[PDB]
Short mmCIF file of C-alpha atoms and ligand atoms in Angstrom, two decimals:
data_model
loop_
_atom_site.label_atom_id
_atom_site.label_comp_id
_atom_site.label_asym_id
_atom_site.label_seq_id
_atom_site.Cartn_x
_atom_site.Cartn_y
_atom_site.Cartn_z
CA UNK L 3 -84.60 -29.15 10.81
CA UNK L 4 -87.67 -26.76 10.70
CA UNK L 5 -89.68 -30.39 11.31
CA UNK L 6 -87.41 -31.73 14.06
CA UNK L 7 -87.90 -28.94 15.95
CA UNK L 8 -91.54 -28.62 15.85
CA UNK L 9 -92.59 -30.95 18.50
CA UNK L 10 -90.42 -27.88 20.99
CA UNK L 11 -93.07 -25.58 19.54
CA UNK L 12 -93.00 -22.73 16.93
CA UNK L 13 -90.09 -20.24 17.10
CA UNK L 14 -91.68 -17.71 19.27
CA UNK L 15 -92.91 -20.64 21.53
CA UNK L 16 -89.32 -22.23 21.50
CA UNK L 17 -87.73 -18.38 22.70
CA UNK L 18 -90.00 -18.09 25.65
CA UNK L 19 -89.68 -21.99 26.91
CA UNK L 20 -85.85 -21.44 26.69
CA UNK L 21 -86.51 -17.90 28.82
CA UNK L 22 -88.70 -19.59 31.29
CA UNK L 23 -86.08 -22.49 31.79
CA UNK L 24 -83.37 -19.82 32.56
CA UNK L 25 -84.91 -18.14 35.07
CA UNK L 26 -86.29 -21.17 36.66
CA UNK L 27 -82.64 -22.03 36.75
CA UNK L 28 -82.75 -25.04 34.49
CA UNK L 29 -80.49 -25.21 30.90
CA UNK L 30 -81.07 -24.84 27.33
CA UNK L 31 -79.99 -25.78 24.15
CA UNK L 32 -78.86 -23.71 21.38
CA UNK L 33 -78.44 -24.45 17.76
CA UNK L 34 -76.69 -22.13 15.62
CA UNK L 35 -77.33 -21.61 11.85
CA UNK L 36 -77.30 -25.15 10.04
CA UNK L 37 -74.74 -23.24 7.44
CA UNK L 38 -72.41 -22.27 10.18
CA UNK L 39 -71.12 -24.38 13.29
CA UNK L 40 -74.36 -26.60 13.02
CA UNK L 41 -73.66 -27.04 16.71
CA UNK L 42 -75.39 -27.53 19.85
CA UNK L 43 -74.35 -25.88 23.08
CA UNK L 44 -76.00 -26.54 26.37
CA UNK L 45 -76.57 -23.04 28.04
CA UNK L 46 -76.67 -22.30 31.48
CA UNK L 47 -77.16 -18.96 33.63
CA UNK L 48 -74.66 -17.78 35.40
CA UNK L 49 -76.21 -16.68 38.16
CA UNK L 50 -77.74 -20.16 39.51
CA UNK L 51 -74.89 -22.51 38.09
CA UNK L 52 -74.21 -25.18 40.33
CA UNK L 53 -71.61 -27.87 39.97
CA UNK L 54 -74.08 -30.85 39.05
CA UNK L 55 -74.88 -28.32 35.98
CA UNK L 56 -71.55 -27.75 35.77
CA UNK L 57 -70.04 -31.52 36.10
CA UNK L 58 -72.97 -32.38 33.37
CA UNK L 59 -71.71 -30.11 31.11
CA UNK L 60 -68.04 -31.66 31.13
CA UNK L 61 -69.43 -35.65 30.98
CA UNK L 62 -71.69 -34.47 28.51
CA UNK L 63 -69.81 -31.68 26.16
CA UNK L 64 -66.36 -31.41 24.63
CA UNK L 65 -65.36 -29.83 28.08
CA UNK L 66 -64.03 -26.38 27.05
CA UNK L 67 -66.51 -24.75 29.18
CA UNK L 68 -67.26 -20.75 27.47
CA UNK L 69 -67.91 -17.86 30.06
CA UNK L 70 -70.03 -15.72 28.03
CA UNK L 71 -69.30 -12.04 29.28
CA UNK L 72 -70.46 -8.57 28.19
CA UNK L 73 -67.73 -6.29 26.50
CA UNK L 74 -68.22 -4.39 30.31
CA UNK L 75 -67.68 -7.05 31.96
CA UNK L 76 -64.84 -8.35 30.07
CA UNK L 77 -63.07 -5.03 30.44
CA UNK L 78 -63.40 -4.88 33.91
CA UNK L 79 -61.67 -7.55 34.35
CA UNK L 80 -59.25 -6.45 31.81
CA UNK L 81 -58.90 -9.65 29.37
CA UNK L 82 -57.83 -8.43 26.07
CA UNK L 83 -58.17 -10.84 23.18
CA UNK L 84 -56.33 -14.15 23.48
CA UNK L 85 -54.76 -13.07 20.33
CA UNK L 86 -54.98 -9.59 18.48
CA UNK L 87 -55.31 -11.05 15.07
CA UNK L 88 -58.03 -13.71 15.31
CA UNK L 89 -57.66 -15.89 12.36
CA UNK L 90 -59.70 -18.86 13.54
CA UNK L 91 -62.73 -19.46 11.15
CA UNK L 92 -65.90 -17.70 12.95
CA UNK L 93 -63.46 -15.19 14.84
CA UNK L 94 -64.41 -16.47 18.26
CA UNK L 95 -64.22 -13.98 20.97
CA UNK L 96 -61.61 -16.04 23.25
CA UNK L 97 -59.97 -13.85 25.78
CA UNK L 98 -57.29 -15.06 27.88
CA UNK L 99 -58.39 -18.47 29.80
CA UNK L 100 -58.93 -17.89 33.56
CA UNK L 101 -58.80 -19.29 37.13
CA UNK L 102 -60.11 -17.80 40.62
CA UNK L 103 -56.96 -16.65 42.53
CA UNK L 104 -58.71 -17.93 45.54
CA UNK L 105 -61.00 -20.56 46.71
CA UNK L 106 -59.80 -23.30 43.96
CA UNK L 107 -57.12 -25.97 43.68
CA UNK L 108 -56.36 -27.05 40.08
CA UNK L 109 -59.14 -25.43 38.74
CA UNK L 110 -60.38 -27.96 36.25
CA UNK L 111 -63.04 -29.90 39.17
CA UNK L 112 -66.62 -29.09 38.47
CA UNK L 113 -66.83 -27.07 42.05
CA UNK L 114 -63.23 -25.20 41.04
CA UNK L 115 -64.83 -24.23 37.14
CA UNK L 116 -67.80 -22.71 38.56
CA UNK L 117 -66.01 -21.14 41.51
CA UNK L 118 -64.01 -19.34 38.61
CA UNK L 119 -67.15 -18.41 36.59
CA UNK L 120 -68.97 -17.30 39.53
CA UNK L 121 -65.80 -14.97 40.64
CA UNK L 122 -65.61 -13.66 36.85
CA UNK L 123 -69.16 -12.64 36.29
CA UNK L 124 -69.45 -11.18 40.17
CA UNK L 125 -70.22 -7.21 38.73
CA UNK L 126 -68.14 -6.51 42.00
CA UNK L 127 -65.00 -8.12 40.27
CA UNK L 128 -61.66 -6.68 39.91
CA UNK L 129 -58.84 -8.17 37.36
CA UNK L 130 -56.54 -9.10 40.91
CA UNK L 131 -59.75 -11.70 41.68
CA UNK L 132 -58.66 -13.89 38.85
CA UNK L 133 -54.95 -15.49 37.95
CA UNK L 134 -54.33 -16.07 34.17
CA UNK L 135 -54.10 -18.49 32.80
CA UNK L 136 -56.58 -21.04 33.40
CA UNK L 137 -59.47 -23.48 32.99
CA UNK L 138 -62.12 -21.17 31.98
CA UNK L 139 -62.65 -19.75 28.96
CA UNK L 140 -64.32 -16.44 28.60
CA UNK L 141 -65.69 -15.40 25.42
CA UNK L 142 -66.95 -11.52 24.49
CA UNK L 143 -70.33 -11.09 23.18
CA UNK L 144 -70.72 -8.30 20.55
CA UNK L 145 -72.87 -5.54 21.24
CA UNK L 146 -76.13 -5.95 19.85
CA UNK L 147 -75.90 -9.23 20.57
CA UNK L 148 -77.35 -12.32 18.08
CA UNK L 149 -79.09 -9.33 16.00
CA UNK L 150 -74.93 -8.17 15.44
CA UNK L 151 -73.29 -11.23 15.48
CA UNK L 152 -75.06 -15.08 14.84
CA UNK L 153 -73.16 -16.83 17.40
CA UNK L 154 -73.72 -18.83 20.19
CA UNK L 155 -71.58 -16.53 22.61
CA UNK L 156 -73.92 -13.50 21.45
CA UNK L 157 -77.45 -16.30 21.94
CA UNK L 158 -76.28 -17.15 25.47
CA UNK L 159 -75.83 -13.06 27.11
CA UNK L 160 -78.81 -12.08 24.66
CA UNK L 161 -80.56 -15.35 26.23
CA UNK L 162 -79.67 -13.93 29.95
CA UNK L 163 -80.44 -10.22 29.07
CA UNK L 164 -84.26 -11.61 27.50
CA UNK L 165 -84.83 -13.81 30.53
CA UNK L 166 -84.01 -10.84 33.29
CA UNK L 167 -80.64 -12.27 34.44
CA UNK L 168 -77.83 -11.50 35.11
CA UNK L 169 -75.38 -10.95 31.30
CA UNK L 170 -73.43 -14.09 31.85
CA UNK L 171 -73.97 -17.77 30.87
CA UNK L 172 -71.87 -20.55 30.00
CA UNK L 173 -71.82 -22.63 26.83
CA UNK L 174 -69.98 -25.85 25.83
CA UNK L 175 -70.89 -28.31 22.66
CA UNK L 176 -72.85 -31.07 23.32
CA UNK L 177 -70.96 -34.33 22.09
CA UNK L 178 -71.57 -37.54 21.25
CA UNK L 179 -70.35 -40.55 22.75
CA UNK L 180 -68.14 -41.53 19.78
CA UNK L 181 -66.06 -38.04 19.85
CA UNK L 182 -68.16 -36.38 16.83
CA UNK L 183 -70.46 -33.42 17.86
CA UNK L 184 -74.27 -34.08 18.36
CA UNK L 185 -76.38 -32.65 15.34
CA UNK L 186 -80.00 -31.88 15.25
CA UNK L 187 -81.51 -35.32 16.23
CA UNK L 188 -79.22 -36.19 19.07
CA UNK L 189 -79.33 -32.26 20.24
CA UNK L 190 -83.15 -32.84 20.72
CA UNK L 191 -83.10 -36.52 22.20
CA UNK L 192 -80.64 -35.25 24.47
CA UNK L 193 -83.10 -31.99 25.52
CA UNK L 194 -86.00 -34.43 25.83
CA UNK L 195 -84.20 -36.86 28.06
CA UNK L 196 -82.56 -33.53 30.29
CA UNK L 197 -85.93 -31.55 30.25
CA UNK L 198 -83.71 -28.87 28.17
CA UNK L 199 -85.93 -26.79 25.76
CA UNK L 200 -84.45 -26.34 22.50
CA UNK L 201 -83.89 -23.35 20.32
CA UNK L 202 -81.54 -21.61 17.28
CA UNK L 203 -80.24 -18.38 16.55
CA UNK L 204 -82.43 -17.89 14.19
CA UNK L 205 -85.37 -18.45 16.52
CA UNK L 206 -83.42 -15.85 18.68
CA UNK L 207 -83.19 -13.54 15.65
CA UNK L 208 -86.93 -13.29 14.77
CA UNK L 209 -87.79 -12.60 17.87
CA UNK L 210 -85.64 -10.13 18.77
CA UNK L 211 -86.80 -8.29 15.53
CA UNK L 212 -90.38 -9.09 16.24
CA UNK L 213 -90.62 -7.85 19.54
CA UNK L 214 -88.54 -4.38 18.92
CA UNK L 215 -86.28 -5.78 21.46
CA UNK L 216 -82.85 -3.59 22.02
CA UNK L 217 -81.03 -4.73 25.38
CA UNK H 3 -50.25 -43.91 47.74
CA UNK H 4 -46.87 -46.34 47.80
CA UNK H 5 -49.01 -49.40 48.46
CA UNK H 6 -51.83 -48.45 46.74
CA UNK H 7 -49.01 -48.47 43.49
CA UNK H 8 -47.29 -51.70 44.17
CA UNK H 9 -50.28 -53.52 42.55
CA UNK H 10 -48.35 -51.71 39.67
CA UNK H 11 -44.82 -52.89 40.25
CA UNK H 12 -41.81 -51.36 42.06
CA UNK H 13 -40.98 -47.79 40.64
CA UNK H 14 -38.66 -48.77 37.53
CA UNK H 15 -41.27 -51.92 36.60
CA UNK H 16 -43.50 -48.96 36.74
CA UNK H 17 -42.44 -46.77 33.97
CA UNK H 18 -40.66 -49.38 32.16
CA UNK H 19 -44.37 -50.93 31.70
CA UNK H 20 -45.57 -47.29 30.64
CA UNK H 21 -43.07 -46.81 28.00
CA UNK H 22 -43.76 -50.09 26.70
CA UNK H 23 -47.21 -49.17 26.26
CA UNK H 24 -46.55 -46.35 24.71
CA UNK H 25 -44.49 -48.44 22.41
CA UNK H 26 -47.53 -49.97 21.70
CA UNK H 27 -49.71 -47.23 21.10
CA UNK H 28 -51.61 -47.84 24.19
CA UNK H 29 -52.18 -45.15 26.87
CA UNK H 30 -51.00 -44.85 30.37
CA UNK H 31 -51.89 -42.55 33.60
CA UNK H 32 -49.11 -40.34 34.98
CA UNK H 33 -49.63 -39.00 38.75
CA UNK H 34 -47.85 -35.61 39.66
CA UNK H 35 -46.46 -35.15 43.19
CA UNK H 36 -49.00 -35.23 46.32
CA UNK H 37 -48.16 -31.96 47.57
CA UNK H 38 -48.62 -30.48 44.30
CA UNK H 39 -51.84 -31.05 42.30
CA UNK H 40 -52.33 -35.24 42.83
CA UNK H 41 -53.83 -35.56 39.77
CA UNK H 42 -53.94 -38.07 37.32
CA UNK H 43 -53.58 -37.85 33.64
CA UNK H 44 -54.22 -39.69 30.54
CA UNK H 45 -51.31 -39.68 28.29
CA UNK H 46 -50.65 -40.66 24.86
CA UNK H 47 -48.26 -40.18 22.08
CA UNK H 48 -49.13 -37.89 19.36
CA UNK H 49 -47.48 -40.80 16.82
CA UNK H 50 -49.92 -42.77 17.59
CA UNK H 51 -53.42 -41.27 18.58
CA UNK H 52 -56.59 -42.29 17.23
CA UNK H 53 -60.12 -40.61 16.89
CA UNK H 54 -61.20 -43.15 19.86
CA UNK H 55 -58.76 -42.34 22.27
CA UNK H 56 -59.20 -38.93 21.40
CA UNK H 57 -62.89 -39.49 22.27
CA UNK H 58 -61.81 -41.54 25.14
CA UNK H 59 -60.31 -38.64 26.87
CA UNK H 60 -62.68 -36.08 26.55
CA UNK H 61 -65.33 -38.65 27.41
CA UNK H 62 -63.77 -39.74 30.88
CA UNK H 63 -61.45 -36.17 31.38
CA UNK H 64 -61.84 -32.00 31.54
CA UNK H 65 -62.22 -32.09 28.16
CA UNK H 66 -59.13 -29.57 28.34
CA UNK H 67 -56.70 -31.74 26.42
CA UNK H 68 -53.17 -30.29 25.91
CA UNK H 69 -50.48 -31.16 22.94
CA UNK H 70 -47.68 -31.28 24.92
CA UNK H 71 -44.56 -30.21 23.01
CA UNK H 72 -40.90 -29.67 23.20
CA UNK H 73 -39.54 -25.93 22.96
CA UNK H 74 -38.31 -26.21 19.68
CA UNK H 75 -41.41 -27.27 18.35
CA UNK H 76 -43.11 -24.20 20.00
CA UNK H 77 -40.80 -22.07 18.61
CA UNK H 78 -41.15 -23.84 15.41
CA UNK H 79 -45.13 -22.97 15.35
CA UNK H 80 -44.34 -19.75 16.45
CA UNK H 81 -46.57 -20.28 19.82
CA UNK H 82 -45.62 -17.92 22.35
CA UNK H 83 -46.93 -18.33 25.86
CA UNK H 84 -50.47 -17.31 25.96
CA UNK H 85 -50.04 -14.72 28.97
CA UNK H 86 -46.26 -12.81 29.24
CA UNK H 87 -46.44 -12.62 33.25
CA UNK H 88 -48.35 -15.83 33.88
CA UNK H 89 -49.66 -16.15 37.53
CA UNK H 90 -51.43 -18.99 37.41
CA UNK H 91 -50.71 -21.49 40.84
CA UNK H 92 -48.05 -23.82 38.98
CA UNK H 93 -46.91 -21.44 35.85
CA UNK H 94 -48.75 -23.99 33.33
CA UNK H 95 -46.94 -23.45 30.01
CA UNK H 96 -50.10 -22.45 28.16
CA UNK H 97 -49.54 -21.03 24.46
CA UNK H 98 -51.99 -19.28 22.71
CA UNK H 99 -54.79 -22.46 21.52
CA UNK H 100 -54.30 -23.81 17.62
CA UNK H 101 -57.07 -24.96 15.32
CA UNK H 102 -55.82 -27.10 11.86
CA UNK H 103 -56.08 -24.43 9.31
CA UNK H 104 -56.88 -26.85 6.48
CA UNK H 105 -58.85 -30.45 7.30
CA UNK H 106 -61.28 -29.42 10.42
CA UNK H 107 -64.55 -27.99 10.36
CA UNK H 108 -65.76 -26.49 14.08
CA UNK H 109 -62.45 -27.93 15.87
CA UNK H 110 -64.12 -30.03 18.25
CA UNK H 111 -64.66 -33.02 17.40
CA UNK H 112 -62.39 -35.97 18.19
CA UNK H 113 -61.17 -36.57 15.26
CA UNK H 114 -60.60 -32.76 14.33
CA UNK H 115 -58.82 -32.33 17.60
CA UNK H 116 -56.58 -35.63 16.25
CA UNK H 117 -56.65 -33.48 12.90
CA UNK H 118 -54.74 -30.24 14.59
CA UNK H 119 -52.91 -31.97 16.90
CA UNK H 120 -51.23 -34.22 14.18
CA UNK H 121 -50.73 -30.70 12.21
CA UNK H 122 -49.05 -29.51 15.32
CA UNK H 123 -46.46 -32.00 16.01
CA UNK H 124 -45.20 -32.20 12.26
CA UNK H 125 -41.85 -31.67 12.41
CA UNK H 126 -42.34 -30.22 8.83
CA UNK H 127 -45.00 -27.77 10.40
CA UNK H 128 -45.17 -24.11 9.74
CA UNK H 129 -46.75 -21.41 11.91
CA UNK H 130 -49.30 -20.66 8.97
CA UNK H 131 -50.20 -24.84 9.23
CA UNK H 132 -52.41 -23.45 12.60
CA UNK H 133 -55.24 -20.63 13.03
CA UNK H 134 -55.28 -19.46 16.62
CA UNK H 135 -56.73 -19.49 18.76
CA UNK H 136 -59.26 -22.76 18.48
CA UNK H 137 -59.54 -25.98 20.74
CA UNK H 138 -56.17 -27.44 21.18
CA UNK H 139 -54.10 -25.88 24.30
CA UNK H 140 -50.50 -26.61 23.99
CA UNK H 141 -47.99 -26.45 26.60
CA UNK H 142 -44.20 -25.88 26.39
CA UNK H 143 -42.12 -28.37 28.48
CA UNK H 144 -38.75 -27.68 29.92
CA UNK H 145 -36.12 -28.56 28.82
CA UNK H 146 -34.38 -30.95 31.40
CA UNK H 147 -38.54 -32.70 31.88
CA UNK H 148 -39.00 -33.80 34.64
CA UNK H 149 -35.06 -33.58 35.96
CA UNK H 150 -35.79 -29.72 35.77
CA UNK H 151 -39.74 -29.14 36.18
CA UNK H 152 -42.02 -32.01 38.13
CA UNK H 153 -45.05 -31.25 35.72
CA UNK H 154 -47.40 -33.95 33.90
CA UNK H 155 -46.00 -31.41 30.83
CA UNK H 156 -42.66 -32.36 31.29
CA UNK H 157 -43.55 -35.81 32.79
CA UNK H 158 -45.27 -36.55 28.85
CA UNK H 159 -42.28 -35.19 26.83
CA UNK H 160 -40.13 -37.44 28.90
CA UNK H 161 -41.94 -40.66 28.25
CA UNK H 162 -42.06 -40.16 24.56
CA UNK H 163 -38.49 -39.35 24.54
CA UNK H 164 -37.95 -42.37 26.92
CA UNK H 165 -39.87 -44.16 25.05
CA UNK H 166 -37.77 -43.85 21.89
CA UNK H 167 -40.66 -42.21 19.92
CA UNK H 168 -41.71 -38.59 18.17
CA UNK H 169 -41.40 -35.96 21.07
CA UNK H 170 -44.99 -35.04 21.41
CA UNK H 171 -47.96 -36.28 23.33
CA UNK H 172 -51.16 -35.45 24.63
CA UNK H 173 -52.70 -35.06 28.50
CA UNK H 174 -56.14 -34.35 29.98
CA UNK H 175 -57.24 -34.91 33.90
CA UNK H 176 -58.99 -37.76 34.77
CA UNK H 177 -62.50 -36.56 36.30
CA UNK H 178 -65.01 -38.91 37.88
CA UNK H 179 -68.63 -38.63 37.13
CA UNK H 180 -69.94 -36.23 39.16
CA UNK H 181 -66.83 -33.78 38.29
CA UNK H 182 -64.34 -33.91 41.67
CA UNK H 183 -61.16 -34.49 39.96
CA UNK H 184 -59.82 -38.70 39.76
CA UNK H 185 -57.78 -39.18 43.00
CA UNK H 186 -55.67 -42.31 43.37
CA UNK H 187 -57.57 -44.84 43.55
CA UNK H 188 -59.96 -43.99 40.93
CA UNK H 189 -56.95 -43.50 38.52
CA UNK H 190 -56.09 -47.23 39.57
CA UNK H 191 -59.41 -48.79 39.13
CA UNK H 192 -60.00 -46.70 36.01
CA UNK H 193 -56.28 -48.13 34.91
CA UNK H 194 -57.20 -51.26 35.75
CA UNK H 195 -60.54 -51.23 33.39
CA UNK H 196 -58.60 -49.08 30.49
CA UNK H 197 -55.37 -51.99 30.37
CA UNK H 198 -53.43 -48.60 31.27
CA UNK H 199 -50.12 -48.44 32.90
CA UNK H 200 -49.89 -45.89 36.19
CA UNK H 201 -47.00 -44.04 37.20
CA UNK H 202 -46.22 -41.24 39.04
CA UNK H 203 -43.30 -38.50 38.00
CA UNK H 204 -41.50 -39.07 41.61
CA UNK H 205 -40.95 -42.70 39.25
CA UNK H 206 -39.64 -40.81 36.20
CA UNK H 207 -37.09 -38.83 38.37
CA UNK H 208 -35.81 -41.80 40.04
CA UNK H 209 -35.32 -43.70 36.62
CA UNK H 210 -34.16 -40.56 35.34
CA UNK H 211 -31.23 -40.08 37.41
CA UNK H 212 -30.47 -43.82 38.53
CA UNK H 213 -30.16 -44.57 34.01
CA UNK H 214 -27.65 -41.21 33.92
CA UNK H 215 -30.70 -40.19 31.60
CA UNK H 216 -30.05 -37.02 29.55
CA UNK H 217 -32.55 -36.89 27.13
O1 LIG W 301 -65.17 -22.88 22.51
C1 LIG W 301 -66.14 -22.36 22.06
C2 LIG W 301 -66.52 -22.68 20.61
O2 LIG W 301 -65.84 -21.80 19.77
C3 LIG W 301 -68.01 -22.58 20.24
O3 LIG W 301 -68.06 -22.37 18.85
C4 LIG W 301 -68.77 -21.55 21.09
O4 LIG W 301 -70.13 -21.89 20.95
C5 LIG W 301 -68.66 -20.06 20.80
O5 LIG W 301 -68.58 -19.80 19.45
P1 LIG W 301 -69.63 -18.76 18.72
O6 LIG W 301 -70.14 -17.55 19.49
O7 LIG W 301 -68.83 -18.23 17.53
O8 LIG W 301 -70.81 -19.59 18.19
O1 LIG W 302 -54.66 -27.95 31.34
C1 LIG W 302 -53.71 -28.51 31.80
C2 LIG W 302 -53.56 -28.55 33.32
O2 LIG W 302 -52.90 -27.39 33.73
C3 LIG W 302 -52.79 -29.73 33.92
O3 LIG W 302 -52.32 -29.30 35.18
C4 LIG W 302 -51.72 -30.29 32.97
O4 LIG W 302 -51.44 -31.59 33.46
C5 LIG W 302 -50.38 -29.59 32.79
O5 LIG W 302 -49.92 -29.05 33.97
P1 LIG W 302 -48.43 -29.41 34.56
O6 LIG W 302 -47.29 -29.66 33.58
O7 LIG W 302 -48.05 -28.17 35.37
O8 LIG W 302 -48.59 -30.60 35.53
MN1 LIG W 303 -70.74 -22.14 18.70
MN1 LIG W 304 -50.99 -31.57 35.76
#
């Protein structure tokens, strides 16, 4: 894998090309460990999603769009767990699914999913602003972020956080046409073709560590 | 919408050509009321789902695709409703999401979605059969279908049980390219293309009560 992703640059290289893509308000792509999910998730900030990001996620993805909040954020909007004892195999931080109480019909059109996300991560927000449940899927990052927890909903706020953002992306796993996820190869024809810098956790992990970065 | 559907036969024509296809293993597209959401869904039966049209729906849908199930087979996975005071705009029957506990890897994938859904709708199952939460959103239809509750939850129940097969099936919204949600006529033309039968669930009430149709 090491090889494949050369051509995007060395690690350090690959962190700050993702960075600069996020705050230019373009996406990324981000591999987890090859022993874990193996996955790729297209990444986008929160704070300049727009619904041709959006509506390429679903074509492209398995369509569960992620909401990738803070713990803060997640409380103040008070969404406890989806289910108090987690037994699902990485221990993904699913809250409750959501939907904007206003300014959305069914909630599953690209406008209506990023109307939802945009209401959710608005620091401003109050529980009343969204009905559960719904077509968004929020996910808690751990503190500490990728250096506390290897996933991708810890890469994606700790992605945000580097970059200057605002703490909230959204994630969803790039797919092939066939139904089976997109590995390595596919993950970085697929960046190539979209202008989407690749990256992994890992990449994410030396950095952090590297650069004495808390956030 | 009336004439747009009479390319499609006369109401009864209409879903006695959907349950044939379903017969068939083939899968048809189910319209809910205007005034409600006028959306169109993909349906198929759970007996008889593939990895394709598994891959088929989350290719050309949200990507949010829901085991429908009766309330004994809830109750039978031990699913309760995801939220206790659900507020969302139509009271979408949402249990807490299921992953396959044995036979998946991320949960994802086509044919692992195929995988827990087909672990679901066992009659044999058993609660411990499913990790929760994961990637598979069942909903609870009522009982009565579509004679109590106009939903494309009920609406799916119905047509298996119509249908004379296993009580389960599964439904995702058709969404066009660019991510507005499949109105009408793109369910038609994208009917047309798919060999899918269209109907909408004012159809199923009709035939419903005109057959004296407990079910
Ligand atoms: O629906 C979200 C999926 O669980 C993905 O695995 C998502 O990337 C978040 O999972 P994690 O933070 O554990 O990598
Ligand atoms: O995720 C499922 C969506 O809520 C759709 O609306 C689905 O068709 C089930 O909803 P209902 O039975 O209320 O039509
Ligand atoms: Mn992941
Ligand atoms: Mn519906």
């Amino acid at each position: 894998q090491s090889s494949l992703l050369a051509e995007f640059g060395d690690p350090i290289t690959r962190v700050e090309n993702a960075l600069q893509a996020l705050r230019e308000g373009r996406g990324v792509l981000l591999l987890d460990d090859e022993d874990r999910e193996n996955e790729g998730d297209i990444i986008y900030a929160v704070e300049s999603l727009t619904t041709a990001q959006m509506a390429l996620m679903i074509r492209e993805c398995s369509g569960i769009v992620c909401l990738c909040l803070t713990e803060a954020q997640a409380d103040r909007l008070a969404l406890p767990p989806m289910v108090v004892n987690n037994n699902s195999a990485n221990q993904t931080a699913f809250t409750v699914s959501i939907e904007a109480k206003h300014g959305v019909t069914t909630g599953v059109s690209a406008q209506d999913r990023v109307t939802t996300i945009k209401t959710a991560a608005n620091p401003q927000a109050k529980p009343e602003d969204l009905a559960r449940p719904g077509h968004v899927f929020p996910l808690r990052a751990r503190a500490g972020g990728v250096l506390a927890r290897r996933g991708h909903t810890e890469g994606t706020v700790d992605l945000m956080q580097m970059a200057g953002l605002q703490p909230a992306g959204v994630l969803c796993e790039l797919t092939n046409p066939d139904g089976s996820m997109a590995k390595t190869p596919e993950i970085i024809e697929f960046g190539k073709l979209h202008n989407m810098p690749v990256l992994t956790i890992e990449d994410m992990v030396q950095y952090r560590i590297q650069f004495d970065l808390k956030l």
